[PDB]
Design a binder for this molecule. Structure first.
Ligand SMILES: Nc1nc2c(ncn2[C@@H]2O[C@H](COP(=O)(O)OP(=O)(O)NP(=O)(O)O)[C@@H](O)[C@H]2O)c(=O)[nH]1
Ligand SMILES: [Mg+2]
Ligand SMILES: [Mg+2]
Ligand SMILES: [Mg+2]
Ligand SMILES: [Mg+2]
Ligand SMILES: [Mg+2]
Ligand SMILES: [Mg+2]
Ligand SMILES: [Mg+2]
Ligand SMILES: [Mg+2]
Ligand SMILES: [Mg+2]
Ligand SMILES: [Mg+2]
Ligand SMILES: [Mg+2]
Ligand SMILES: [Mg+2]
Ligand SMILES: [Mg+2]
Ligand SMILES: [Mg+2]
Ligand SMILES: [Mg+2]
Ligand SMILES: [Mg+2]
Lengths: 61, 205, 614
RNA sequence: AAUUGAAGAGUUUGAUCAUGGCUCAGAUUGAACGCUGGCGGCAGGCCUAACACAUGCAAGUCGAACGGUAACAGGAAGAAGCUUGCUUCUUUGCUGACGAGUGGCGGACGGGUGAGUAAUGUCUGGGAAACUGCCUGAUGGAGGGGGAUAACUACUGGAAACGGUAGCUAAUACCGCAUAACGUCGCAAGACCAAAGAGGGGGACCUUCGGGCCUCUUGCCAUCGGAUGUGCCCAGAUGGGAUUAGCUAGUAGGUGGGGUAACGGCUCACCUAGGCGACGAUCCCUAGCUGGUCUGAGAGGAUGACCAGCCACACUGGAACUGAGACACGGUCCAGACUCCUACGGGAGGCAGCAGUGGGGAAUAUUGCACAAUGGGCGCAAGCCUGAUGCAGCCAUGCCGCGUGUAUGAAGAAGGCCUUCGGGUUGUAAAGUACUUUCAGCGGGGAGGAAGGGAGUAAAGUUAAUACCUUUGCUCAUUGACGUUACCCGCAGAAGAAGCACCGGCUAACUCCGUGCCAGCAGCCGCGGUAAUACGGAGGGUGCAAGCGUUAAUCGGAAUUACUGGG
RNA sequence: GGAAGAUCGUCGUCUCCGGUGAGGCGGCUGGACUUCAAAUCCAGUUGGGGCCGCCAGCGGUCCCGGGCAGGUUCGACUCCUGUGAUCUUCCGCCA
């Protein structure tokens, strides 16, 4: 079981995502994170700084 | 690579005269160097050890306009070199061609030196060099290309050179604006502001 | 010569093709199994002449109509097989309506099952077909009576297909490709096959795959079952491409195209022509080349309709698409993509006239170029995208005279002049509003004039006026040439009482304000303007003197190079009696001026007139 | 001269000192993922499925070994056209050459991969009982005969694959015979063992006028030396597990036979009962080893990607032949699974070669150019071959270098943010003015990688010989894939080019707004419950920079396996 | 791509429901109460669109809504007919 970061997500029934390490230290037994922005896990929108994390393209303007 | 931004906010982060932009003046002083390093620049901040030695290292590496990875290269060779690591570090860092161009005096600022050397104007031993990192060997003359001569910038800088009082380890004629480099300086003949051992232990972690 | 077979089910669509081309269209096992054409099959007819016609066989079933709309793209000629069994049937009508909305130029009716019904029925069906064709706007049509089983009228039908002309497209166009079947051939790569709507491609080209959104190098290609180094529009192009994407990821309805496209847009305007009236804000199925989407239509003015997509889609200007009933069954209306980026304020009275201007008025890109200019500034990214214009084609705007081309958007000479006038009069208003200022700055001008526009165009336009000489500026302050930085009486009234005062000994700002009962900030600014006039000089911030003492300050500095040869403080007290604070501020005033310069212990004299003749 | 080298921090408590974990600061990588991305150099680039493979190429060469003439170019008798000296046609291996065939040499090198292997391997150091093609030194021979056979011809089998029947022919193919000891055997006496020619030139002379003869080059057989390469033995070193303690019947020794290039239970007959093992036998799990790479003050720890040496393997499992060398990647034979054709008899195939495709995976490239250089095969040589190699393509994967301007510029503009509403900050930053043009773009010039090889010529050497051939000079013409090369010279315009992370402590860098233990952040300790420097946005700063972050891995710190260096 | 199938109100889920909806459970907001919770009683918990003036984390109007339409019926979340979003299963992709 892998944690999901950021505010809001599109993940539902069978979704193919890819996971990276790191542990949350609150929910014992989740040793992983899912990356935002790779395969079927969409980069959280409505976010500006720290956006290489969370995988959202830059605003044009 | 290069910085490309406000010079004298970098000059006023350390509150020193960093020589970054001189031209008609030396220090601007009308630009409020000590009073505004940033929005919270006005309030003085206590500096912890890592901050004093890192702040110093940032200072010197800005005054000579070098980035950090080739500055770390300069350090690893400096250590590998025989003799005191601080002294010969600084000395080999002054061997940089752009620094020399500034010390011979023909140039406005070391960034202008970067300009002039990058633009094919410099000539060493009858060969042209673009590289600002080129370490000038001792007892070697360096000139500026004959067609590069007649540029307005070089003399208007020569005037500045006479004003700054010149260095004693280099002999510059400046009749043809061709000077000769002599020997690598020693820590005692220059600066008395940078404290280099702060850098050497900062990299001794 | 792409020729698509259409007609109702089991009216001999495929059998005709095998007769003409000796190619069994059905390839899928199930169609073999069930005796039908579940999905689109392709047949080709190479000729010794060296030109190969392209044959696209589409189903007739209403259920598989969504498939037929993918293959009706880019047809040069369409042949509707009608079988004399029941003759014209409703589905035949549906195929005709679909071909009408796609605006195919011409069609050949070929009548099958001649053997099955006697000649009378041949004449009757002939009459009925000739009557139906008039309904859907195809007047001239060539009716052939043939039975593919015996090949009776196959020969007569053959010459006509070769006689068909090939409908050409403009020489300069961005290559645009409609993906149809993404299938991996075992040998060498990913080969995605699709109809090339426009342009040419060669083996070295780099393309941008959509939905994967990744560039892909063409490994190899087949023009129409023929290996070649180049591929031109008007034919199915098998395209073997390298890159990051793969077949499973590719979904029919992806575009391959030469350059990164702007973000897909949900809203769009369409010319509207329909067989049955529509209704405002109603759900429908939008069918675009190899694409199925559901969006809700709106009605604006006359034959102008608005499509809103719940699924974003890449469209280009002048793209015919079909709008069908949302629950299917009925083809009701047609569509053309006219504007790619409609904003709000749709039904406002001035704009509908404009929409008429943009669409009915122009059938070509150059005319469109003028229309958009009338509307405002024209972004080359958007215009290139809408018109699919190549570099050579794009440069043609540049060739037309009177076009302002800044960093991005084009501007017509009339509209440019209009903006110039607006900017000038706005300039004049600001000029009048502050009469104590040297002028407005460049950027402030752009913000006070047209904040919503592109910066490069508006500023370049400003440059145009600068060069014309309508605006003369000094020190980077742009004021009308007429301005003299004279001032207003409101300042002079203080400056009259301030005059004797200033004369017999000048004093500091805060003291001045205290002496004349005027606000400190007001007093400092009015005197700064007085100093811009040349009446008083600040040797240091907030300290103002007359001129007659400035020259006297130079008289005291005059004796230093000649009597000493150095500059030091001591002589302040030992020469006239002028204080140290005063003398030092004098020096910094002259250092900024350039009368003296400071280095270590002494001041230099590189550029002043302090020097006497001898 | 070859070293010069060792740092700490946070968290147990109300506070303290100890013990002890966890976490961080460093360096590194064949890395991947997110955002961003201008250029150049030099590197590197299936770590997973030793999983399956479409298509193309990756081993040929010698007519100076031979019989020949399939294809081409000459020449020849002739055809004899007509343009009467240009052209038309048969015949002609007779010359240059050469398909197919026999023969020689190569294919046992070069290239790939790490499945197996805990020793049959590898490294270090010794040794006796060996063999070694082409290379090199010496000593000598190289005489004299025959019978076939492929190609070819006539027939025939079969779709193909490949054969079969009959007849003919050559060889540096093969077999006799003669000869031969410093060679083999044997204590000795004695007995026994081999060969092959071809090419270039040539005065006299032979001339079945085919050729013999002279000279040179090169080839062949024998024995001993050298180099080289390889086989075999031995001692030590090279993982983990005792929650594996017994193991071995050809295995432990002998005598004799056999076998090998050679010692050897290598193998067999008979005899004896040995032999290995708490210094870990046997069994199990994992594994290619090494020079070295990373790290560390060091001692150690991890590791074995690139480069070089050795080993093993070639669809899986076996076997042998030819050979100096194989139990053989692109050889043979049988079996097996899987793919393919077929006329249903039968065949065919093996990318862990270079590309490339499918699959697996977080992930790893072009179905390119050249033999110009180095090297290799064959050849007298020219040459031909060469996916070795040289280069190019792709990818920020790494390391390194450069640029994205420089100088001046204050009523310190506007906008943004903040305010104590006085102002501060962004900020010399922008604007303006005066300059440059690096790289990129456009156009010209322009090295080096090229040594030799070929033709001619001169001398010397050789020889019967002013010839051939060899050597070394001299003259000529020429050999570049990269390549639109590096580099240089002109043109125009600052013109075409800056991000990413962080800002509570550790750890460099703080303020306002939104939310209100919700939404979220988190390497650790923690934040958020209506005044959040920790969340989200903004403004400002800081650190790195064509990169910045995150994740994974190793060492360090960790004296936290303590030999140095603990209890 | 085809065929078969599941689900998709009004904050979430289940039971339904031809009288214009009902009921349970939970969640959220507000009240009593505190630093905020938990607990115990109370009160509430329709959304989305088009057109028009700011973009204002709006203001009016009109409409539609058990995924999106239609038909039935006096009246449909419920009956019936199409089709879409995500998604399960089988089949096939061959320039
Ligand atoms: N007598 C006759 N029958 C024909 C002819 N052409 C087709 N058919 C009938 O059509 C059947 C095959 O169908 P097809 O020709 O493919 O009709 P189609 O319209 O192409 N099939 P679909 O519409 O589903 O694609 C045959 O069984 C045959 O009976 C014709 O020329 N003559
Ligand atoms: Mg059909
Ligand atoms: Mg049917
Ligand atoms: Mg609707
Ligand atoms: Mg505590
Ligand atoms: Mg041999
Ligand atoms: Mg004999
Ligand atoms: Mg072997
Ligand atoms: Mg092979
Ligand atoms: Mg995969
Ligand atoms: Mg070949
Ligand atoms: Mg760098
Ligand atoms: Mg250039
Ligand atoms: Mg002689
Ligand atoms: Mg954070
Ligand atoms: Mg240790
Ligand atoms: Mg201890």
């Amino acid at each position: 079981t892998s944690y999901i970061g950021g505010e809001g997500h599109n993940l539902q029934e069978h979704s193919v995502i890819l996971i990276r390490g790191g542990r949350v230290k609150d929910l014992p037994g989740v040793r992983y994170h899912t990356v935002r922005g790779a395969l079927d896990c969409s980069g959280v929108k409505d976010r500006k700084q720290a956006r290489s994390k969370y995988g959202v393209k830059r605003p044009k303007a | 690579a290069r910085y490309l931004g406000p010079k004298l906010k970098l000059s006023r982060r350390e509150g020193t005269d960093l020589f970054l932009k001189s031209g008609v003046r030396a220090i601007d002083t009308k630009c409020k160097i000590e009073q505004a390093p940033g929005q919270h620049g006005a309030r003085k901040p206590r500096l912890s050890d890592y901050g004093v030695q890192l702040r110093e290292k940032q200072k010197v590496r800005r005054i000579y306009g070098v980035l950090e990875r080739q500055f770390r290269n300069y350090y690893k060779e400096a250590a590998r070199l025989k003799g005191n690591t601080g002294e010969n570090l600084l000395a080999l860092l002054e061997g940089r061609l752009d620094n020399v161009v500034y010390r011979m005096g023909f140039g406005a600022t070391r960034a202008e030196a970067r300009q002039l050397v990058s633009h094919k104007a410099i000539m060493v031993n009858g060969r042209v060099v673009n590289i600002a990192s080129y370490q000038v060997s001792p007892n070697d003359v360096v000139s500026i290309r004959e067609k590069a001569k007649k540029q307005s910038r070089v003399k208007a800088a020569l005037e500045l050179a006479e004003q700054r009082e010149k260095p004693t380890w280099l002999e510059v004629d400046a009749g043809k604006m061709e000077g000769t480099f002599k020997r690598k300086p020693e820590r005692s003949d220059l600066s008395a502001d940078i404290n280099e051992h702060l850098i050497v232990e900062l990299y001794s972690k | 010569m792409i020729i698509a077979t259409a007609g109702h089910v089991d009216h001999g669509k495929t059998t005709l093709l095998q007769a003409i081309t000796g190619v069994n269209a059905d390839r899928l096992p199930e169609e073999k199994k069930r005796g039908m054409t579940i999905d689109l099959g392709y047949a080709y007819w190479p000729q010794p002449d060296g030109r190969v016609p392209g044959f696209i066989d589409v189903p007739g079933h209403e259920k598989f109509l969504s498939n037929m709309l993918a293959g009706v793209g880019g047809i040069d000629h369409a042949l509707l097989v009608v079988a004399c069994d029941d003759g014209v049937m409703a589905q035949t009508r549906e195929h005709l309506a679909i071909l009408q909305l796609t605006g195919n130029p011409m069609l050949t009716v070929a009548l099958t099952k001649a053997d099955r019904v006697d000649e009378a029925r041949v004449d009757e069906v002939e009459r009925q077909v000739k009557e139906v064709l008039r309904e859907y706007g195809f007047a001239e049509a060539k009716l052939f009576i043939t039975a593919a089983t015996e090949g009776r009228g196959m020969d007569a039908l053959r010459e006509h297909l070769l006689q068909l002309p090939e409908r050409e497209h403009a020489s300069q166009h961005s290559f645009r490709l409609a993906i149809d079947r993404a299938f991996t051939v075992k040998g060498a790569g990913l080969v995605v096959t699709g109809t090339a709507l426009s342009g040419e491609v060669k083996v070295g080209d780099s393309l941008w795959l959509t939905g994967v959104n990744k560039p892909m190098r063409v490994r190899a290609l087949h023009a129409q079952n023929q290996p070649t180094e180049t591929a031109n529009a008007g034919q199915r192009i098998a395209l073997n491409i390298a890159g990051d994407a793969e077949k499973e990821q590719i979904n029919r309805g992806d575009w391959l195209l030469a350059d990164v496209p702007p973000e897909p847009f949900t809203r769009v305007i369409v010319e509207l022509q329909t067989h049955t009236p529509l209704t405002q804000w109603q759900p429908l199925h939008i069918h675009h080349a190899a694409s199925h989407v559901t969006g809700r239509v709106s009605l604006l003015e006359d034959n102008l309709a608005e499509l809103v997509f719940d699924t974003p889609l890449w469209l280009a200007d002048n793209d015919r698409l079909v709008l069908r009933d949302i629950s299917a069954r009925n083809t009701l209306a047609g569509a053309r993509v006219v504007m790619l980026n409609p904003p709000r304020r749709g039904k406002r009275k001035p704009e509908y006239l404009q929409w008429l201007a943009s669409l009915a008025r122009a059938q070509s890109d150059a005319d469109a170029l003028s229309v958009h200019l009338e509307r405002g500034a024209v972004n080359l990214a958007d215009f290139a995208w809408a018109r699919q214009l190549n570099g050579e084609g794009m440069r043609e705007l540049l060739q037309q005279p009177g076009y302002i081309q800044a960093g991005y958007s084009l501007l017509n000479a009339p509209v440019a002049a209009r903006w110039q006038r607006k900017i000038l009069d706005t300039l004049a208003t600001y000029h009048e509003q502050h009469r104590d200022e040297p002028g407005p700055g460049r950027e402030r001008l752009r913000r006070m004039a047209l904040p919503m526009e592109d910066e490069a165009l508006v500023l370049l336009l400003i440059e145009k006026m600068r060069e014309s000489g309508d605006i003369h500026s000094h020190h980077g302050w742009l004021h009308l040439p007429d301005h003299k930085a004279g001032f207003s009486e409101e300042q002079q009234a203080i400056w009259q009482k301030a005059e004797p005062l200033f004369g017999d000994e000048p004093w500091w700002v805060r003291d001045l304000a205290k002496e004349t009962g005027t606000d400190e900030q007001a007093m400092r600014l009015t005197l700064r303007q007085a100093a811009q006039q040349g009446i008083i000089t600040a040797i240091v911030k907030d300290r103002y003197y007359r001129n007659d003492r400035i020259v006297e300050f130079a008289n005291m500095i005059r004796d230093l190079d000649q009597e000493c040869g150095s500059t030091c403080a001591a002589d302040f007290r030992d020469r006239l009696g002028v204080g140290r604070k005063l003398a030092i501020q004098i020096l910094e005033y002259f250092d900024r001026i350039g009368f003296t310069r400071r280095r270590g212990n002494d001041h230099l004299l590189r550029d002043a007139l302090l020097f006497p003749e001898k």
